[PDB]
Design an enzyme around this catalytic site. Sequence first.
Site, PDB file in Angstrom:
ATOM      1  N   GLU A  40      -0.082  59.839  -3.074  1.00 33.57           N
ATOM      2  CA  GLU A  40       0.344  58.746  -2.189  1.00 33.57           C
ATOM      3  C   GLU A  40      -0.602  57.556  -2.014  1.00 33.57           C
ATOM      4  O   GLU A  40      -0.857  57.122  -0.892  1.00 33.57           O
ATOM      5  CB  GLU A  40       0.672  59.316  -0.797  1.00 33.57           C
TER       6      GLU A  40
HETATM    7  C1  LIG Z   1       0.302  66.344  -1.962  1.00 33.57           C
HETATM    8  C2  LIG Z   1       0.846  65.900  -0.636  1.00 33.57           C
HETATM    9  N1  LIG Z   1       0.501  64.866   0.000  1.00 33.57           N
HETATM   10  C3  LIG Z   1       1.193  64.687   1.248  1.00 33.57           C
HETATM   11  C4  LIG Z   1       0.290  65.245   2.436  1.00 33.57           C
HETATM   12  O1  LIG Z   1      -0.695  64.283   2.780  1.00 33.57           O
HETATM   13  C5  LIG Z   1       1.096  65.631   3.655  1.00 33.57           C
HETATM   14  O2  LIG Z   1       0.243  66.252   4.595  1.00 33.57           O
HETATM   15  C6  LIG Z   1       2.219  66.575   3.262  1.00 33.57           C
HETATM   16  C7  LIG Z   1       3.054  67.063   4.436  1.00 33.57           C
HETATM   17  O3  LIG Z   1       4.196  67.778   3.982  1.00 33.57           O
HETATM   18  O4  LIG Z   1       3.110  65.925   2.336  1.00 33.57           O
HETATM   19  C8  LIG Z   1       2.547  65.451   1.148  1.00 33.57           C
HETATM   20  S1  LIG Z   1       2.153  66.863   0.062  1.00 33.57           S
END
Ligand SMILES: CC1=N[C@@H]2[C@@H](O)[C@H](O)[C@@H](CO)O[C@@H]2S1
EC number: 3.2.1.52
Lengths: 237, 237, 53, 53, 190, 190
Positions: A40
Amino acid sequence: LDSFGPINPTLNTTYSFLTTFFKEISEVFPDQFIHLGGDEVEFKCWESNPKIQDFMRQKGFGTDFKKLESFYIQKVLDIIATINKGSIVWQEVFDDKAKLAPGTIVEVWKDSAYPEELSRVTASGFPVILSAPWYLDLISYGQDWRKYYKVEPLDFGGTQKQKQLFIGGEACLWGEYVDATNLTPRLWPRASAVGERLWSSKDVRDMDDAYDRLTRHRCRMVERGIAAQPLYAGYCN
Amino acid sequence: LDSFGPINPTLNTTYSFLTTFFKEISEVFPDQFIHLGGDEVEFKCWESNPKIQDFMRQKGFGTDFKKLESFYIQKVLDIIATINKGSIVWQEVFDDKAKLAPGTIVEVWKDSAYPEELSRVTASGFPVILSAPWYLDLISYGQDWRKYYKVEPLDFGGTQKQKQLFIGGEACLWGEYVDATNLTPRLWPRASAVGERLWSSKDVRDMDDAYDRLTRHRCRMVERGIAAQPLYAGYCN
Amino acid sequence: ALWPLPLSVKMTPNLLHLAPENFYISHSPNSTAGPSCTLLEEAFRRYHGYIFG
Amino acid sequence: ALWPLPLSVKMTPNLLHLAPENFYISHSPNSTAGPSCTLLEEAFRRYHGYIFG
Amino acid sequence: TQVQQLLVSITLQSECDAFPNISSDESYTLLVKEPVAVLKANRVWGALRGLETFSQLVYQDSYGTFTINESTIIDSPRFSHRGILIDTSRHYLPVKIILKTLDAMAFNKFNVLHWHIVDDQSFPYQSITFPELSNKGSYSLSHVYTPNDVRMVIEYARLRGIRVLPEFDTPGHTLSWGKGQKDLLTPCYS
Amino acid sequence: TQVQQLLVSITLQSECDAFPNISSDESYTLLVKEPVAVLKANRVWGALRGLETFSQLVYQDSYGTFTINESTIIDSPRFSHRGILIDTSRHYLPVKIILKTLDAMAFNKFNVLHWHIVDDQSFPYQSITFPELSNKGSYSLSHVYTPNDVRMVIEYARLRGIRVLPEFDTPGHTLSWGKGQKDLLTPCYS
Ligand SMILES: CC1=N[C@@H]2[C@@H](O)[C@H](O)[C@@H](CO)O[C@@H]2S1
Ligand SMILES: *[C@@H]1O[C@H](CO)[C@@H](O[C@@H]2O[C@H](CO)[C@@H](O)[C@H](O)[C@H]2NC(C)=O)[C@H](O)[C@H]1NC(C)=O
Ligand SMILES: *[C@@H]1O[C@H](CO)[C@@H](O[C@@H]2O[C@H](CO)[C@@H](O)[C@H](O)[C@H]2NC(C)=O)[C@H](O)[C@H]1NC(C)=O
Ligand SMILES: CC1=N[C@@H]2[C@@H](O)[C@H](O)[C@@H](CO)O[C@@H]2S1
């Protein structure tokens, strides 16, 4: 829109910091692998920054910030390789077209079309770990242990060679809503569903038998000091 | 399809048992009210029973088992009235057209069209309790405290007189998936959302302010030995 | 950090202090309740623990 | 009540009993591990507690 | 600077020895001032709520100093039935966790414990007149609420201004009742 | 009738003092018979799994008698990476609850603790070479994992055949890193 964004990948101080830092990590943690993350990454901050905009045109990345992300990640992977450790990475690093050295493990976490992610990753030669269907932080009503248990991880498209690259999985309990007051009951025995699926044979999937052994196993966890939550109405002892 | 169904409402031994039993309850529990239940009565067993079929035609209930349910419940309500206690009943008893004595509290639990249930119950003159939107056993991901907090219980159609009949509500934690290992974190602080909505003024609904005070309050519960779960990322002290 | 939020809250900026071993919760002399009131006596003692503990 | 279910399980109806203060977990004489093996020694002791506790 | 005392004044017949009910008066005012703060309430029930609020106003500053702001609070509930439903049939809950729940209810000004004591799966309520209900309907003999367990929960609740509302659900949700009371349940042909 | 002993035979170089890795051999066989039961495994890792299984076969009968059936078990894992991810940034988790999680992992034959140690909200990892990362990035000074806390978790895990896989996520998920490492994070114009 915020105040600070991702790590600045255009500065030599960044990579000098990461070098020294990861060297310490290579000494503290004896495991062969270090998870570098890469999930992300937000580009709005990089896009809005003038010095980054300058750096972007300095080597022809245009308006494609996936190339800047790739550029950053490749330098970090190289640092890990130089200290003789393996790297693990969330799928975005693979999806955004970064150049990964053979051996790099890719962890598939996005629940949308995850089998096709498994195919792509394995087809490209990389070992893969699955976490997508086993987000234990995503709680819901009822016997959700069954949906985790019913997952057959090798039901994706590919040759045997690709299926040999699938090395396992992880049940994830992200922490936004979890601390000491609720971790254990949330984690167990829902994670036990994933544990059997990852240990036992592929054809072990009789639900009634799984329910029978898991309630008893859960009672065992409780007897041993793990406050594992119930599967359904009942009692222990 | 099962082995045993609901209480047999055609036998005098039933009502003789219930009389003696509820008399004991009227002595053990000092509260003015006794909840008689009346939820989810299954008719298939009554329908499939020959002696009940006989009893059904004995007083013209036809094939309408709501009339047999009503007949049963009216006798139990009469037992409660004779021991000088008030009765509380789940909405089905009202919906299936049983004759309730004035004063009988109706607890509205069905989440479908619950405001219109509140209108009907109050329009018929009865005091009402709301539980429908506050099923804390129905867990879900994230800050579900907000949805419980955002409920405005008097947003149903009716006159002031009808709205004066709304006496309160209950946050329900049904037990299929709950025991000692997980009750407290599941219950608190999600139930605190309902507690403010039922205590404080109608216009107290600033979400940011509610979040600010509830995290601190939740930390207070923890300091006092109640393992209330987090609202979001953070720490206490 | 009040929960539930009281109907009406009016505060001043004037801070006052409390001393745990010199702070008592007691019956006002005009009250209808006194030491005989187990309910109030037990509440006095446990809230003393909650305030300071 | 095995979890996870082992790859291959074959049992007989023959029941055997264990005596807590007369049941030991030890190294087979042909083993490559011995008392020096902290990992196995600690496991022997904690599984003794789990079996009987 | 020093609040030396919190004086508690009950204005009307206290109801100290009574059980709370739907119409119980839970109103109070709280005047925080030096040297004596005052909590005033029509009855015991309002004083209990006011003690909770007073405790939420006291805090420790950065150096550990117990502090409170001079203030005036007028308070009374919007609705009088404020309940928590617990279910001790689907799983037995030990008395201790019921007492803890009552403590948490008090901290939150909840005033009704809706005790869904029995259901299909088990019958932990030990009946004096009908001993076989629990003897045959409970999960086991240690998953029962004795007359004394029940009294303890009622008294513990009363001390926090909490009503104990028992639910003995019928005619459905009664499978456990049939173990000890013969001929009560309808047999199913199928 | 009596099983007096469970003998444990490691066949190859034990790997007793080593850390487990992806290719660690976790296979074993368990022969339950009288008077001596035998657990055989190529390495230490398989013996640990086999001890867990042996404990799941012993039960107490209705009179309290410790019993086990004569049996033979052949076992080895379908996949070698069997992980649990924990997140100690969104909330700090005390070392004790991490150790308990490792115990539960062993009971379930999980072999990887994926420690998502840092993230945006807090930086509890105390770095020796960069002390300011935790000093400025942690929630508070008691929400930190010291070098010794880290060693303890690693050793505790190793004793159960569990690998500790650290995650230090970058370039995103790094807000807490910026408190102690100046000029690392990109400033946002807006
Ligand atoms: C790899 C991921 N990065 C994210 C995390 O920062 C969150 O905590 C999580 C919560 O479901 O979702 C996605 S999984
Ligand atoms: C309780 O009293 C404190 C202390 O006076 C109040 O806090 C301060 O308010 C003053 C003026 O409003 C400000 O100058 C300070 O910055 C505030 N904090 C400090 C450290 O003094 C507080 O607002 C009062 N509580 C309420 C809600 O009225
Ligand atoms: C473990 O041994 C027990 C005892 O022999 C087995 O249980 C019995 O099996 C026999 C014959 O199969 C039956 O006649 C009994 O009813 C069973 N129970 C009792 C009380 O003896 C048990 O099946 C064995 N375990 C397995 C899975 O093989
Ligand atoms: C009244 C009600 N009767 C039912 C209960 O028996 C269940 O336990 C509950 C679970 O949500 O759902 C409805 S609410």
